[PDB]
C-alpha cells in the first residue's frame, strides 16, 4: 500500500538534539525503512554521543565556515573537528560521496513570533538566519553531493512557504531534487511519529511527484 | 514504516468514471489496505458496471435532489433509480449506516480555466458548481454518516485551497472529520499510482494530524 524501501539510499539529517524530538523520530523511520543514516548534531550533544544512525558528526548549522565562528564560540566546541556546514558536508562526501536524502530539523521558538515593534535588528536577523536561512545553506552545501532525484525536507516546529517553493525550483533545475517542508506543532494529540510518518512519506518515492509542498502537522492549527 | 490498515473501515468514493483515472486507482489502493469500498459512478457508466469495490451506486454529483434533475436528464439515466447526492447518501446509510472515508474525484477540464472576458455566466457558474461546489454538497450530505475522526479527500485534476481549509474547519468542529485536497496533473512522470498513493496517505491514520492540506501531485508544475 505505502511501501517504503530505502535500503540502498543514505540520508543526512541535521538538527538532532534530544530523544523526544522530531529529528530523532525521523532517524528511526528512515533507519527502519532500511536507509543508511548520517546525523549532524549540535556540537555539545555530539561529544556526549561520540563517547538509529550509522554515523554522527558535530554540526552548528548556523555557521557556514570557520570564519563565521566567533573566537569565543570557537574555543569552548573544543577539539571536536569542524562543525560548520561546509566542513561537515566535506566530511560526508569523503565518508559516503553521495546522499539520497537530506533533512533539516529546525526548532525555532522565541523570536519570529515576537511582535515587530518589540524586536531588535540583531535579534530579528538572528531568528531569520537561524529559522530559515540555515536550511538554504545546508541545501546549498549538500546539493552538489546529492544523487539526482534525491529528496530534501526542512522541518520546522514549536513563511518558509516561500523558500520552499523557491528552493524547490532552484534545486529542481539543478539536480532534479525534491524539496519540501513540514510545519509542526509542539509535541487531537501530536506525537513525534506523526511528523516522522509525514516526513518519511515526503522523503520517499511515494511522493516522487511532490515538491515545493509545505504540510502543517499541527491538528488543523494553521489556518483554523 | 507507513502501515495502512483499513480493514475495519469503509469508504465511499465519488467520481470513478474510467479505469485509467485517479479515482479508480484510489478504490484499489483503499481496497488493498483492507477497506470496504463503496463507489458512486456517473449514472451512464453505472449500467455497464451493474453487468475493487464491494458496492456501486449511480451518482451524478452535480445534482443534489430529484427536483434538480431536469426532465431532459430524467427521461434518458432511465431505470437507474435515484442518482442525486441526497438519494445516494440515503442508500449508503441504509446499506452500511456509517463510513470512515469519503473521496471525491472531480475532473474539470476547459471551463473554469478559460479567460474571464471570454466566458459566459451560465458556463462560468456551471464550472464552479461542478469543479468545487459538488464537493461541498457531497460532504454536506455524507458528513452526518461519517464516524468521528473520519477522513475526507477532494481530488481535482487536469482556487480551492481556502474552500478546503474552510470545509476542514467546519467538518472539524462538526464531527472531527479531516478534509484534504489533492490537485493533480494529467496522466519521473505522473501516473494514477502517484495520486492514489498520496490519496491513501492523507486518508489514513498516518495523516491523523493533517487537515486542510492541499497537495499538488503535479511534478512541481504548480508552485514553480
Return phi, psi of residue B182, to 5°. Answer: -115, 135
Structural domain including B60 reads 9-224
Structure determination technique employed: X-ray
Residue B125 counted as domain residue? yes
Query: Is residue A219 less than 8 Å (CB to CB) from chain B?
Result: yes
| Angstroms from A121 CA to nearest CA on chain B | 31
Give the span between the Cα atoms of B20 and B38, in whole angstroms: 18
Residue B1 counted as domain residue? no
B114: domain CATH number is: 3.40.50.720
Q: Which cell numbers in the block locate residue A132?
A: 530559515
> A209 vs B219: CB contact, 8 Å cut-off?
yes
Residue A2 counted as domain residue? no
Kindly provide the residue ranges of all beta strands, DSSP E only, lying in A35-170, ordered along the sequence. Answer: 36-41, 55-58, 99-107, 146-157
How many CA atoms lie less than 13 Å away from A175 in the CB half-sphere? 19
Is A15 in contact with A104 (CB distance < 8 Å)?
yes
Q: How many CB atoms lie within 10 A of CB B60?
A: 22
> B1 vs A200: CB contact, 8 Å cut-off?
yes
Residue B132 counted as domain residue? yes
Beta strand pairing call for A214-217 and B55-58: unpaired
Residue B4 counted as domain residue? no
Among B197, B210, B219, the residue with its CB nearest the CB of A206 is: B197
Is A13 in contact with A30 (CB distance < 8 Å)?
yes
Nearest CA in chain A to B164: A223
How many A-B residue pairs are in contact by the CB < 8 A criterion? 108
Is A222 in contact with B164 (CB distance < 8 Å)?
no
Total residues belonging to chain B: 224
Residue B148 counted as domain residue? yes
Among B4, B211, B219, the residue with its CB nearest the CB of A220 is: B211
Give the span between the Cα atoms of B2 and A4, in whole angstroms: 7
Least Cα distance to B79 among B49, B38, B46, B41 occurs for: B46
Give the span between the Cα atoms of B58 and B17, in whole angstroms: 11
Least Cα distance to B153 among B169, B168, B172 occurs for: B168
How many domains does chain B contain in total? 1
Nearest CA in chain A to B35: A1
Among A32, A210, A216, the residue with its CB nearest the CB of B1 is: A32
Residue B224 counted as domain residue? yes
Query: Is residue B114 less than 8 Å (CB to CB) from chain A?
Result: no
Give the span between the Cα atoms of A58 and B126, in whole angstroms: 59
Residue A3 counted as domain residue? no
Phi-psi region of A119 (alpha: psi -120 to 50; beta: other; left: phi over 0): beta
Amino acid at each position: 500500500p505505502l511501501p517504503v524501501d530505502l535500503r540502498g539510499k543514505t540520508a543526512f539529517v541535521a538538527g538532532v538534539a534530544d530523544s523526544n524530538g522530531y529529528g530523532w523520530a525521523i532517524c528511526k523511520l528512515l533507519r527502519a525503512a532500511g536507509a543508511r543514516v548520517l546525523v549532524g548534531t549540535w556540537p555539545p550533544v555530539y561529544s556526549i554521543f561520540k563517547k538509529v544512525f550509522d554515523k554522527i558528526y558535530p554540526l552548528d548549522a548556523v555557521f557556514d565556515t570557520p570564519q563565521d565562528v566567533p573566537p569565543e564560540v570557537s574555543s569552548n566546541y573544543a577539539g571536536v573537528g569542524g562543525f560548520t556546514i561546509s566542513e561537515v558536508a566535506e566530511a560526508v562526501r569523503a565518508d559516503v560521496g553521495q546522499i539520497d536524502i537530506l533533512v533539516h530539523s529546525l526548532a525555532n521558538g522565541p523570536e519570529v513570533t515576537k511582535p515587530l515593534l518589540q524586536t531588535s535588528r540583531k535579534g530579528y536577523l538572528a531568528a531569520v538566519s537561524s529559522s530559515s536561512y540555515s536550511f538554504v545553506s545546508l541545501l546549498q552545501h549538500f546539493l552538489p553531493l546529492m544523487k539526482e532525484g534525491g529528496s530534501a525536507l526542512a522541518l520546522s516546529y514549536i513563511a518558509l512557504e516561500s523558500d520552499c517553493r523557491t528552493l524547490a525550483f532552484e534545486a529542481g533545475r539543478a539536480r532534479a531534487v525534491r524539496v519540501n517542508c513540514i510545519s509542526a506543532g509542539p509535541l487531537k494529540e501530536l506525537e513525534s511519529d506523526d511528523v516522522g510518518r509525514a516526513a518519511l512519506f515526503l522523503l520517499s518515492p511515494l511522493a516522487r511527484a511532490v515538491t515545493g509542498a509545505t504540510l502543517y502537522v499541527d491538528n488543523g492549527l494553521h489556518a483554523m
